[PDB]
Symmetry: D2
Subunit: 116 residues, 4 copies
């Protein structure tokens, strides 16, 4: 798994389950092209977004749909979503974990980048 | 001052000074149009971005140029920038502070919304 | 004001008001002796804890009563309190702001140390 | 594993490896008694601190030695350590993950609490 997303809920102390995630990749014309999407599992994890072959060098945006997550719990949150934008694989293939910790008016995000 | 942005450095324990910040408002065609911008002060703060009259309900994006900040310090960072996207809502008098706490591979952001 | 404490609420997007805060200084016997305390203001801030003369180098603990804050809101929290333990060091004129951003099962804290 | 600790490094974008962790439990006389200790692995995880039988109801403190971690990397950090204090198992047995994300002048901590 070259790219994994993990989402946690800071209000409930739980994984954030069924969170929609959309990944885009910047194209040659500077537009964002759809690249992959999915939703988090019962463990707050989203695996299988892409493959080693498909995950080439580029600028990627990981959009986490936090607003829909909170609304389903009856909370009206501040943000529309949480976006994570980064250059990937420009020094060769790496494994990326994008983690986010969510609250209704705040979020934290970090990356764990490893060389296989 | 209906909108203020505050940026802090989690590595050095200081305000993040001279950081470029751009604010955009979502247009009817779903495109991001420039709304306001500036550079954070010595206290890591950016004031005077807009006025009560101009800051109507809508979807706004605050883009913080974190990459340039870390590069200026010789530190290789993860993110191209930090983006904060939110809806402004009229529900009594509201002032919005968007705060961001920066590290090379991580950031936190919160909103402090007061009367 | 060599030491200020600022507490924010990540659930409601507001200052955390009327939060009890206790500051301790580590004694020679390795026990925590009370140093200063108060309750955060309407802006989530606690000023006037100490003076330049009293705030000497040493190890300090700031304890924030997060549990009472969440209980007052009907929310069951994880932590008994939030504790921030640090050394004050003389290295030119320093002012310390200890900030904390609170959620029911999580908190972030940072130090803003300036001249 | 009723109690696990996970530590991440926000400067390097990596697990925080070889971080010392000490767990204490409040005794009847209100003193902190040593309960368990260990250090994080190459994945930033610390498993096997305790057992279901030993991890009874109580108030626990998890002390993460962040200062020693940073000093070994040549950084002089702000905090002495990061402390996490919580009541455990007072509504019956739960599984606890205590996570922390570290920077030299800041840290974030969250808990993931699950019912097996
Ligand atoms: O079970 B796991 O593999 C696991 C469990 C918890 C985390 C938490 C990460 C995290 C991210 C943040 O942005 C802030 C924070 O305090 C913690 C990661 C992996
Ligand atoms: O105008 B002020 O006096 C002010 C306003 C907001 C902050 C926010 C701090 C903060 C701390 C964290 O640990 C995490 C985070 O996202 C933000 C600080 C000072």
């Amino acid at each position: 798994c070259p790219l994994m997303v993990k989402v946690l809920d800071a209000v409930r102390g739980s994984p954030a389950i069924n969170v929609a995630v959309h990944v885009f990749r910047k194209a040659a014309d500077d537009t964002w092209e759809p690249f992959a999407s999915g939703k988090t599992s019962e463990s707050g994890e989203l695996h299988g977004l892409t493959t080693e072959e498909e995950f080439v060098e580029g600028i990627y945006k990981v959009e986490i749909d936090t607003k829909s997550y909170w609304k389903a719990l009856g909370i009206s949150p501040f943000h529309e979503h949480a976006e994570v934008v980064f250059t990937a694989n420009d020094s060769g293939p790496r494994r990326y974990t994008i983690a986010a910790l969510l609250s209704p008016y705040s979020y934290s995000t970090t990356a764990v980048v490893t060389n296989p």
